[PDB]
Short mmCIF file of C-alpha atoms and ligand atoms in Angstrom, two decimals:
data_model
loop_
_atom_site.label_atom_id
_atom_site.label_comp_id
_atom_site.label_asym_id
_atom_site.label_seq_id
_atom_site.Cartn_x
_atom_site.Cartn_y
_atom_site.Cartn_z
CA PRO A 1 -119.48 -104.72 67.92
CA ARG A 2 -120.22 -103.29 71.82
CA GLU A 3 -117.09 -104.61 73.09
CA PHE A 4 -115.28 -102.89 69.51
CA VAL A 5 -116.85 -99.74 69.28
CA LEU A 6 -115.68 -98.88 73.29
CA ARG A 7 -112.34 -100.01 72.81
CA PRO A 8 -109.46 -97.47 72.09
CA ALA A 9 -107.71 -98.00 68.87
CA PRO A 10 -104.76 -100.60 69.22
CA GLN A 11 -101.78 -98.58 69.37
CA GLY A 12 -99.94 -97.91 66.02
CA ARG A 13 -102.89 -98.00 64.09
CA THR A 14 -105.12 -96.21 62.21
CA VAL A 15 -109.01 -97.13 62.11
CA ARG A 16 -110.31 -95.82 59.19
CA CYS A 17 -114.32 -95.33 58.68
CA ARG A 18 -116.90 -93.82 56.47
CA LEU A 19 -119.69 -92.12 57.94
CA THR A 20 -122.57 -91.56 55.94
CA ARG A 21 -125.78 -89.14 56.33
CA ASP A 22 -129.32 -89.57 55.16
CA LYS A 23 -131.10 -86.59 54.78
CA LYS A 24 -134.07 -88.12 53.02
CA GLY A 25 -137.24 -87.00 54.21
CA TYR A 26 -134.04 -85.09 61.39
CA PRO A 27 -131.51 -86.94 59.38
CA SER A 28 -129.80 -90.42 60.06
CA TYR A 29 -125.71 -91.01 60.54
CA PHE A 30 -123.79 -94.19 59.98
CA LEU A 31 -120.66 -95.16 60.59
CA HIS A 32 -119.21 -97.98 58.90
CA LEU A 33 -115.39 -99.63 58.52
CA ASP A 34 -113.81 -98.45 55.14
CA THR A 35 -112.63 -101.59 53.91
CA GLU A 36 -114.26 -103.78 51.07
CA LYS A 37 -116.72 -105.66 53.77
CA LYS A 38 -117.66 -102.36 55.51
CA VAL A 39 -119.14 -103.60 58.74
CA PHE A 40 -121.52 -101.98 60.53
CA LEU A 41 -120.26 -99.92 63.60
CA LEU A 42 -122.90 -96.88 64.76
CA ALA A 43 -126.23 -95.01 63.99
CA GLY A 44 -126.83 -91.74 65.29
CA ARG A 45 -130.09 -89.45 64.91
CA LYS A 46 -131.62 -86.59 66.78
CA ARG A 47 -134.46 -86.92 68.95
CA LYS A 48 -137.60 -85.14 68.18
CA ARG A 49 -139.19 -83.85 70.99
CA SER A 50 -135.77 -82.38 72.39
CA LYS A 51 -135.04 -78.81 73.83
CA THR A 52 -131.34 -79.15 72.71
CA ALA A 53 -129.67 -81.32 70.28
CA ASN A 54 -129.53 -84.75 71.56
CA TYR A 55 -128.00 -87.38 69.46
CA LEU A 56 -129.00 -91.16 70.32
CA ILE A 57 -126.10 -93.73 69.31
CA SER A 58 -126.75 -97.24 68.96
CA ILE A 59 -125.42 -100.41 67.24
CA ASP A 60 -128.59 -101.35 65.56
CA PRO A 61 -129.39 -99.55 62.49
CA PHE A 62 -128.38 -97.92 72.58
CA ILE A 63 -124.85 -97.56 73.57
CA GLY A 64 -124.13 -93.76 74.07
CA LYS A 65 -125.75 -90.08 74.04
CA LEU A 66 -124.63 -86.83 72.29
CA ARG A 67 -125.94 -83.73 74.14
CA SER A 68 -125.60 -80.27 73.02
CA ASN A 69 -125.90 -76.71 75.18
CA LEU A 70 -128.68 -74.25 73.73
CA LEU A 71 -125.98 -72.23 71.61
CA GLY A 72 -124.64 -75.06 70.08
CA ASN A 73 -121.34 -74.71 71.02
CA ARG A 74 -120.50 -77.28 74.19
CA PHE A 75 -121.21 -81.16 73.64
CA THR A 76 -121.02 -84.18 76.09
CA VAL A 77 -120.88 -87.67 74.89
CA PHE A 78 -121.87 -90.20 77.48
CA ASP A 79 -122.34 -93.92 77.17
CA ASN A 80 -125.47 -95.72 77.99
CA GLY A 81 -125.80 -95.09 81.89
CA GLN A 82 -128.49 -93.08 84.11
CA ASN A 83 -128.18 -89.36 84.78
CA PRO A 84 -128.01 -88.62 87.85
CA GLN A 85 -130.38 -85.82 88.31
CA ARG A 86 -133.15 -88.64 87.39
CA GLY A 87 -132.87 -90.36 90.73
CA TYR A 88 -130.04 -90.01 93.59
CA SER A 89 -130.71 -93.82 94.72
CA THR A 90 -129.07 -94.96 91.68
CA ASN A 91 -126.80 -97.56 91.38
CA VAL A 92 -123.42 -95.78 91.13
CA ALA A 93 -121.91 -98.43 88.93
CA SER A 94 -125.13 -97.43 86.43
CA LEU A 95 -124.67 -94.06 86.30
CA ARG A 96 -123.19 -92.70 82.84
CA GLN A 97 -119.86 -92.05 82.03
CA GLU A 98 -118.45 -89.00 80.67
CA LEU A 99 -116.68 -89.90 77.28
CA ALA A 100 -115.80 -86.63 75.65
CA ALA A 101 -116.28 -83.00 75.33
CA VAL A 102 -116.33 -80.82 72.65
CA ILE A 103 -115.98 -76.78 72.86
CA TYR A 104 -116.72 -74.77 69.78
CA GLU A 105 -115.08 -71.09 69.74
CA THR A 106 -114.36 -68.57 67.44
CA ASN A 107 -111.10 -67.90 66.30
CA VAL A 108 -109.01 -64.60 67.48
CA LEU A 109 -106.32 -65.40 64.83
CA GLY A 110 -107.15 -65.33 61.04
CA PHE A 111 -105.91 -67.67 58.35
CA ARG A 112 -106.86 -70.97 60.69
CA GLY A 113 -110.64 -71.20 59.87
CA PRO A 114 -114.32 -69.43 61.57
CA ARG A 115 -113.86 -71.94 64.59
CA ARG A 116 -111.55 -73.52 67.21
CA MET A 117 -112.53 -77.00 68.66
CA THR A 118 -110.95 -78.16 72.08
CA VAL A 119 -111.91 -81.74 72.82
CA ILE A 120 -111.21 -83.16 76.56
CA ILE A 121 -111.25 -86.64 76.98
CA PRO A 122 -110.49 -88.86 80.01
CA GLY A 123 -106.91 -90.02 80.69
CA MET A 124 -105.88 -93.68 80.22
CA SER A 125 -104.52 -96.32 82.87
CA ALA A 126 -100.97 -98.05 82.93
CA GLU A 127 -103.31 -100.81 81.02
CA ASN A 128 -104.55 -98.77 77.97
CA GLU A 129 -108.07 -98.38 79.48
CA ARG A 130 -109.79 -94.87 80.65
CA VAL A 131 -110.26 -94.07 83.60
CA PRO A 132 -113.74 -93.72 83.88
CA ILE A 133 -115.36 -90.10 84.89
CA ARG A 134 -118.63 -90.97 86.36
CA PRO A 135 -120.33 -87.56 87.99
CA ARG A 136 -122.69 -88.41 90.77
CA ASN A 137 -124.08 -84.82 90.35
CA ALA A 138 -124.02 -81.27 88.44
CA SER A 139 -120.87 -80.17 89.98
CA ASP A 140 -118.49 -82.10 88.33
CA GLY A 141 -118.07 -83.42 84.53
CA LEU A 142 -115.77 -82.89 81.56
CA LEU A 143 -116.92 -79.38 80.79
CA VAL A 144 -117.19 -78.08 84.12
CA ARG A 145 -113.31 -79.47 84.66
CA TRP A 146 -112.59 -77.81 81.20
CA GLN A 147 -114.54 -74.52 82.23
CA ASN A 148 -112.41 -74.25 85.94
CA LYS A 149 -109.46 -75.31 84.23
CA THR A 150 -109.24 -78.27 86.42
CA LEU A 151 -107.66 -80.91 84.18
CA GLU A 152 -105.30 -82.44 85.69
CA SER A 153 -105.53 -86.26 84.85
CA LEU A 154 -107.86 -85.78 81.59
CA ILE A 155 -106.36 -85.32 78.06
CA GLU A 156 -107.08 -82.09 76.38
CA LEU A 157 -107.06 -81.80 72.51
CA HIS A 158 -107.25 -79.45 69.73
CA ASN A 159 -108.09 -78.84 66.08
CA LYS A 160 -104.75 -78.88 63.96
CA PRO A 161 -104.69 -75.48 62.42
CA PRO A 162 -103.69 -75.43 58.42
CA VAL A 163 -99.93 -74.56 57.59
CA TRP A 164 -98.88 -71.95 54.84
CA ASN A 165 -97.21 -74.04 52.14
CA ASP A 166 -93.45 -73.07 51.36
CA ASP A 167 -93.98 -72.21 47.75
CA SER A 168 -97.19 -73.15 46.54
CA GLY A 169 -99.70 -70.34 48.10
CA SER A 170 -102.20 -72.06 50.41
CA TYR A 171 -102.46 -73.20 54.27
CA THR A 172 -102.91 -76.49 53.91
CA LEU A 173 -103.25 -79.71 55.81
CA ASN A 174 -102.70 -82.92 54.14
CA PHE A 175 -105.38 -85.33 54.74
CA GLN A 176 -103.23 -88.60 53.00
CA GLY A 177 -106.09 -88.95 50.42
CA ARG A 178 -109.18 -88.95 52.67
CA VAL A 179 -110.92 -85.82 51.61
CA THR A 180 -112.22 -85.37 47.62
CA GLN A 181 -114.18 -82.32 48.48
CA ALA A 182 -112.87 -79.22 50.29
CA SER A 183 -114.70 -78.19 53.57
CA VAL A 184 -114.90 -75.94 56.47
CA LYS A 185 -115.68 -78.91 58.44
CA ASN A 186 -112.85 -80.84 57.43
CA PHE A 187 -110.63 -81.39 60.94
CA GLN A 188 -107.36 -82.80 62.37
CA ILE A 189 -107.65 -83.16 65.98
CA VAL A 190 -103.76 -83.07 67.61
CA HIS A 191 -102.26 -83.17 71.13
CA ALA A 192 -100.51 -79.68 71.85
CA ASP A 193 -97.20 -81.47 72.03
CA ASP A 194 -97.55 -83.63 68.58
CA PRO A 195 -98.75 -81.72 65.56
CA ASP A 196 -98.20 -84.94 63.97
CA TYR A 197 -100.03 -87.69 65.36
CA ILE A 198 -103.40 -87.32 63.87
CA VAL A 199 -105.94 -88.51 66.83
CA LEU A 200 -108.80 -87.66 64.53
CA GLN A 201 -109.41 -86.78 61.37
CA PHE A 202 -112.76 -85.88 59.59
CA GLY A 203 -113.07 -84.94 55.93
CA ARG A 204 -115.67 -84.88 53.24
CA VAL A 205 -115.67 -87.11 50.08
CA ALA A 206 -119.20 -86.74 48.94
CA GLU A 207 -122.81 -84.57 49.59
CA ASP A 208 -123.52 -87.40 51.84
CA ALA A 209 -120.38 -89.13 52.61
CA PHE A 210 -117.23 -88.33 54.91
CA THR A 211 -114.07 -90.21 56.06
CA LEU A 212 -113.55 -90.77 59.78
CA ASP A 213 -109.96 -92.12 60.70
CA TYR A 214 -109.08 -92.50 64.37
CA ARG A 215 -106.50 -93.59 66.48
CA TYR A 216 -105.50 -94.30 70.47
CA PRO A 217 -106.73 -93.33 72.70
CA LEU A 218 -110.11 -93.17 70.87
CA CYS A 219 -112.53 -95.57 70.53
CA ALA A 220 -115.47 -95.29 67.36
CA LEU A 221 -118.09 -93.96 69.49
CA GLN A 222 -115.79 -91.24 71.02
CA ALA A 223 -114.70 -90.42 67.59
CA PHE A 224 -118.47 -90.72 65.88
CA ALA A 225 -119.93 -88.42 68.73
CA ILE A 226 -117.22 -85.60 68.02
CA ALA A 227 -117.92 -85.85 64.45
CA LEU A 228 -121.56 -85.82 64.67
CA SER A 229 -121.19 -82.26 66.93
CA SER A 230 -119.39 -80.80 63.68
CA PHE A 231 -123.15 -80.87 61.98
CA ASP A 232 -124.98 -77.90 62.32
CA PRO B 1 -149.54 -57.22 64.54
CA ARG B 2 -150.87 -58.46 68.12
CA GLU B 3 -149.28 -61.71 67.04
CA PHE B 4 -146.01 -60.11 65.75
CA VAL B 5 -144.89 -58.74 68.63
CA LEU B 6 -145.33 -61.94 70.71
CA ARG B 7 -143.40 -64.05 68.41
CA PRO B 8 -139.88 -64.98 68.76
CA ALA B 9 -137.86 -63.91 65.81
CA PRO B 10 -137.18 -66.44 62.77
CA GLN B 11 -134.32 -68.41 63.87
CA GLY B 12 -131.56 -66.92 62.20
CA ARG B 13 -132.80 -63.72 61.66
CA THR B 14 -132.28 -60.37 62.89
CA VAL B 15 -135.11 -58.21 63.38
CA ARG B 16 -134.03 -54.43 62.92
CA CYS B 17 -136.09 -51.72 64.95
CA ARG B 18 -135.57 -47.80 65.40
CA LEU B 19 -136.91 -46.62 69.16
CA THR B 20 -137.93 -42.87 69.63
CA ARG B 21 -138.45 -41.05 72.12
CA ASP B 22 -140.67 -37.65 72.55
CA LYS B 23 -139.47 -35.60 75.74
CA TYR B 24 -143.45 -38.51 81.59
CA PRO B 25 -142.12 -39.19 78.08
CA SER B 26 -143.74 -41.26 74.85
CA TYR B 27 -141.38 -44.17 73.35
CA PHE B 28 -142.14 -45.99 70.18
CA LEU B 29 -141.09 -48.85 68.42
CA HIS B 30 -141.02 -48.82 64.72
CA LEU B 31 -139.24 -51.59 62.09
CA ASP B 32 -136.47 -49.77 61.00
CA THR B 33 -137.28 -49.73 57.44
CA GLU B 34 -137.73 -47.46 54.24
CA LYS B 35 -141.24 -46.71 55.06
CA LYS B 36 -141.75 -46.49 58.94
CA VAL B 37 -143.86 -49.40 60.46
CA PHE B 38 -145.45 -49.19 64.00
CA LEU B 39 -145.15 -52.25 66.28
CA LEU B 40 -145.29 -50.59 70.38
CA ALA B 41 -145.77 -47.95 72.14
CA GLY B 42 -144.83 -46.94 76.01
CA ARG B 43 -145.41 -44.48 78.87
CA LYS B 44 -144.79 -44.59 82.47
CA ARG B 45 -147.85 -43.88 84.53
CA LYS B 46 -147.68 -40.71 86.21
CA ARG B 47 -149.68 -41.95 89.73
CA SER B 48 -147.72 -45.09 90.24
CA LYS B 49 -146.03 -45.82 93.76
CA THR B 50 -142.79 -47.34 91.62
CA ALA B 51 -141.93 -47.01 87.81
CA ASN B 52 -144.67 -48.54 85.85
CA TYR B 53 -145.08 -48.14 82.17
CA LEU B 54 -147.94 -49.11 80.25
CA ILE B 55 -147.16 -50.95 76.63
CA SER B 56 -149.56 -50.69 73.59
CA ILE B 57 -149.97 -51.75 69.99
CA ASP B 58 -151.70 -48.34 69.52
CA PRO B 59 -149.73 -45.30 69.90
CA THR B 60 -152.92 -43.28 70.16
CA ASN B 61 -154.27 -45.59 73.56
CA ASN B 62 -154.70 -52.70 72.46
CA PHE B 63 -152.93 -52.91 75.68
CA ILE B 64 -150.04 -55.46 75.39
CA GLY B 65 -148.21 -55.36 78.43
CA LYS B 66 -146.51 -53.55 81.56
CA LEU B 67 -142.75 -52.89 82.74
CA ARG B 68 -142.89 -52.82 86.63
CA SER B 69 -140.27 -51.74 88.55
CA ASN B 70 -139.63 -52.59 92.00
CA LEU B 71 -138.89 -50.64 95.26
CA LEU B 72 -135.21 -49.70 94.75
CA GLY B 73 -135.71 -48.99 91.12
CA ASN B 74 -132.96 -51.50 89.97
CA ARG B 75 -135.03 -54.68 89.24
CA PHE B 76 -138.04 -55.00 86.66
CA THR B 77 -140.31 -57.36 85.31
CA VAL B 78 -142.05 -57.12 81.95
CA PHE B 79 -145.47 -59.12 81.96
CA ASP B 80 -148.19 -59.33 79.18
CA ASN B 81 -151.71 -58.46 79.39
CA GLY B 82 -153.48 -60.98 81.59
CA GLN B 83 -154.63 -60.05 84.95
CA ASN B 84 -152.90 -59.78 88.53
CA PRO B 85 -153.47 -62.87 90.85
CA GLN B 86 -153.86 -60.95 93.78
CA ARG B 87 -156.43 -58.83 92.41
CA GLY B 88 -158.59 -61.71 91.96
CA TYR B 89 -157.89 -65.46 92.88
CA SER B 90 -160.90 -67.64 91.54
CA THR B 91 -159.64 -65.81 87.73
CA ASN B 92 -159.22 -68.36 85.15
CA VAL B 93 -155.68 -69.44 85.12
CA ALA B 94 -155.73 -68.88 81.27
CA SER B 95 -156.24 -65.23 81.99
CA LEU B 96 -153.62 -64.69 84.37
CA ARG B 97 -150.50 -62.96 83.65
CA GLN B 98 -147.19 -64.27 82.29
CA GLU B 99 -143.89 -63.33 83.27
CA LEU B 100 -141.90 -62.30 79.99
CA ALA B 101 -138.59 -61.00 81.20
CA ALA B 102 -137.04 -59.53 83.97
CA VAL B 103 -134.08 -57.41 84.51
CA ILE B 104 -131.33 -56.34 87.29
CA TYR B 105 -128.94 -53.53 87.51
CA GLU B 106 -126.53 -53.43 89.43
CA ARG B 107 -124.24 -50.39 84.56
CA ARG B 108 -124.15 -54.04 84.58
CA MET B 109 -127.29 -55.70 83.11
CA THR B 110 -128.86 -59.49 84.06
CA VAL B 111 -131.42 -60.43 81.61
CA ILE B 112 -133.95 -63.23 82.67
CA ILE B 113 -136.63 -65.08 80.21
CA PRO B 114 -138.57 -67.93 80.19
CA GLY B 115 -136.91 -70.89 78.29
CA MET B 116 -138.23 -72.32 74.80
CA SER B 117 -139.81 -75.42 74.16
CA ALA B 118 -138.78 -77.88 71.53
CA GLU B 119 -141.10 -76.43 68.88
CA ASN B 120 -139.36 -72.87 69.57
CA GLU B 121 -142.26 -71.31 71.65
CA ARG B 122 -141.53 -70.14 75.29
CA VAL B 123 -142.84 -72.22 78.13
CA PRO B 124 -144.99 -69.75 80.23
CA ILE B 125 -144.15 -68.47 83.66
CA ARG B 126 -147.59 -67.96 85.10
CA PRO B 127 -147.60 -67.54 88.70
CA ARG B 128 -150.50 -67.79 91.16
CA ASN B 129 -148.74 -65.56 93.80
CA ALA B 130 -145.76 -63.87 94.22
CA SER B 131 -143.98 -66.77 95.59
CA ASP B 132 -143.14 -67.67 91.69
CA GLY B 133 -141.76 -65.53 89.19
CA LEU B 134 -138.62 -64.86 87.25
CA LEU B 135 -136.88 -63.10 89.73
CA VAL B 136 -137.81 -65.41 92.64
CA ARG B 137 -136.29 -68.52 90.79
CA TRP B 138 -133.15 -66.49 89.28
CA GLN B 139 -132.56 -65.51 93.24
CA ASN B 140 -133.08 -68.89 94.39
CA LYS B 141 -130.63 -70.35 91.68
CA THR B 142 -133.68 -72.57 89.63
CA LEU B 143 -132.81 -71.79 86.25
CA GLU B 144 -133.79 -75.11 84.33
CA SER B 145 -136.72 -73.47 83.08
CA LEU B 146 -135.10 -69.96 82.33
CA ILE B 147 -132.38 -68.31 80.16
CA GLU B 148 -129.85 -65.84 81.63
CA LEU B 149 -128.01 -63.13 79.78
CA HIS B 150 -125.71 -60.43 80.67
CA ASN B 151 -124.53 -57.10 78.68
CA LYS B 152 -121.35 -57.74 76.86
CA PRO B 153 -118.36 -56.11 78.51
CA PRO B 154 -116.57 -53.39 75.81
CA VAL B 155 -112.97 -54.28 74.72
CA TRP B 156 -109.92 -51.97 73.23
CA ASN B 157 -110.16 -50.95 69.96
CA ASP B 158 -106.84 -49.37 68.51
CA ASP B 159 -108.69 -47.82 65.68
CA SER B 160 -111.06 -45.63 67.72
CA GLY B 161 -108.63 -45.28 70.99
CA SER B 162 -111.72 -46.68 73.47
CA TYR B 163 -113.43 -49.14 74.93
CA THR B 164 -116.16 -50.35 72.58
CA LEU B 165 -118.04 -53.09 70.48
CA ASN B 166 -118.96 -53.18 67.07
CA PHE B 167 -122.29 -52.14 66.32
CA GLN B 168 -122.00 -52.91 62.99
CA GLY B 169 -122.91 -49.10 61.66
CA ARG B 170 -126.20 -49.21 64.02
CA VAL B 171 -124.79 -46.47 66.52
CA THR B 172 -123.66 -42.95 65.50
CA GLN B 173 -123.40 -41.76 69.10
CA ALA B 174 -121.17 -42.89 72.15
CA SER B 175 -123.38 -43.27 74.97
CA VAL B 176 -123.41 -45.33 78.59
CA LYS B 177 -126.97 -46.90 77.56
CA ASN B 178 -125.42 -48.30 74.67
CA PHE B 179 -125.58 -52.63 75.03
CA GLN B 180 -125.23 -55.57 73.28
CA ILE B 181 -126.97 -58.67 75.36
CA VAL B 182 -125.42 -62.35 74.97
CA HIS B 183 -125.40 -65.32 76.41
CA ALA B 184 -122.30 -66.72 78.57
CA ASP B 185 -121.74 -69.56 76.19
CA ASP B 186 -121.32 -67.60 73.26
CA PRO B 187 -120.30 -63.68 73.15
CA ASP B 188 -120.91 -63.07 69.24
CA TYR B 189 -124.32 -64.13 69.39
CA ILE B 190 -126.09 -60.86 69.75
CA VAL B 191 -129.34 -61.52 71.33
CA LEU B 192 -130.46 -57.70 71.83
CA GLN B 193 -128.30 -54.47 70.82
CA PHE B 194 -129.54 -51.14 71.80
CA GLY B 195 -127.81 -48.44 70.34
CA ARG B 196 -128.08 -44.58 70.35
CA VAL B 197 -128.11 -42.42 66.78
CA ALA B 198 -129.67 -38.90 67.72
CA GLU B 199 -130.95 -37.29 70.68
CA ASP B 200 -134.01 -38.80 70.90
CA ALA B 201 -133.60 -42.02 68.49
CA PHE B 202 -132.05 -45.19 69.07
CA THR B 203 -131.71 -48.58 67.29
CA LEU B 204 -133.05 -51.84 68.67
CA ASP B 205 -131.91 -55.06 66.97
CA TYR B 206 -133.21 -58.58 68.31
CA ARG B 207 -133.00 -62.36 67.75
CA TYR B 208 -134.26 -65.54 68.70
CA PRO B 209 -135.37 -66.29 71.25
CA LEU B 210 -136.84 -62.80 71.86
CA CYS B 211 -139.84 -61.11 70.55
CA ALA B 212 -140.18 -57.04 70.21
CA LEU B 213 -142.48 -57.12 73.25
CA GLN B 214 -139.48 -58.49 75.32
CA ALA B 215 -136.91 -56.12 73.57
CA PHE B 216 -138.77 -52.94 73.98
CA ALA B 217 -139.49 -53.70 77.66
CA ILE B 218 -136.28 -54.56 78.23
CA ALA B 219 -134.67 -51.46 76.54
CA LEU B 220 -137.65 -49.16 78.33
CA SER B 221 -136.13 -50.16 81.75
CA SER B 222 -132.73 -49.09 80.74
CA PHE B 223 -134.17 -45.23 80.85
CA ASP B 224 -135.43 -43.59 83.48
C1 3DP C 1 -129.68 -67.13 74.42
C2 3DP C 1 -130.59 -68.22 73.51
C3 3DP C 1 -130.04 -68.23 71.83
C4 3DP C 1 -130.72 -69.09 71.47
C5 3DP C 1 -129.81 -70.16 70.51
C6 3DP C 1 -129.51 -69.62 69.38
C7 3DP C 1 -128.43 -71.01 68.50
C8 3DP C 1 -127.13 -70.01 67.38
N1 3DP C 1 -126.63 -70.99 67.00
C9 3DP C 1 -125.34 -71.96 67.19
C10 3DP C 1 -127.93 -71.88 66.15
C11 3DP C 1 -126.23 -70.45 65.34
C12 3DP C 1 -126.70 -68.73 65.72
C13 3DP C 1 -127.44 -68.62 64.45
S1 3DP C 1 -127.12 -67.62 63.09
O1 3DP C 1 -125.60 -68.53 62.45
O2 3DP C 1 -126.87 -67.09 62.29
O3 3DP C 1 -125.83 -66.50 63.75
#
């Protein structure tokens, strides 16, 4: 379970998942595989006493964290490690890794939704594993590298804008059956160099259910945390 | 009213006011509604070494804060109505003044405010001496407890044939004094807008995390 949720998806496959929100009575979110045994993967929920959004992610309904800025438009996904700012003598191997960053900006072009999203993730090795990014302090990290435009050995991804349908008068994307309700928060994330390889897809299927389907190089923790950053 | 003017604006809303000047001139802030509703009054003291505005919730006289310039006249601090610690050090801590905002002019403007708690209230900054304060922290680059804001640069508009911003109808007159204050991370969330609509009338519209006293004092700092 712990190993599965951190492993990049096998090459050539799509890992298809159901994400459920529980708003009864902050809301709880759950990820399960979208089979008919529906194995539990991940739970997430916002911490109560927190100044900005902080979701704690676990494999019991503690494996990572999603942290927001105050403006609610720049996110980092961490693993379970320690924050270097809390003590400089902390063992380097125990410091938290940055698994993803997510940047939301308002669109300058019309006809592709209110928001653009950029996803920065670590690069991959020859053995198809992540090359970890494990900052020793403030001055480095995925969002900092994005801001300084130093994305050298990182992977950058964006939301796919919808395409004018040729005879039928729509800006659309083919979600391959994984959307049941139209929603401004449905999305496909792609690499700019291949618009047809859908690295992450998030689709609404009911009031509190969504599809979440991921491919290499993402793992479930990264996929889940990126989907969570899309909620208000 | 004393509560209202210190309360951060409700999240998701914009509090729309009208600022007027009686032309040392007097300044007045009203809610921008069909019936005027009074919020704040301010006036420069005549006999200060540097610029000092007193701010009240009574336009006839309820003392609520102050706006104090530095020596050069390019940096300002906004205080609530508490005591200055330099005047009496045995003074109870709960009675000492708090720093609500600071403004630095180069015009390019930098606005520094206290940060907010998990309950959406200010984390107060209440120095015991002048080794601490908004401007001290900002100049030492220790901004963890604070929020840093700047005026938004104007952009080319083809229609108008000028560098301007979309003030949404709230400006009628072009002016060097017209501004929008934003955070670096989001140029579209307008924390404070100030705009001219006549010779001695302006709009002043604020959003969370600001309260009216921070908003009005920030605007007063832009005059001289
Ligand atoms: C400079 C501090 C601003 C405080 C954060 C405000 C949060 C803004 N959002 C992302 C939660 C949305 C703004 C509210 S809206 O949608 O009504 O403009």
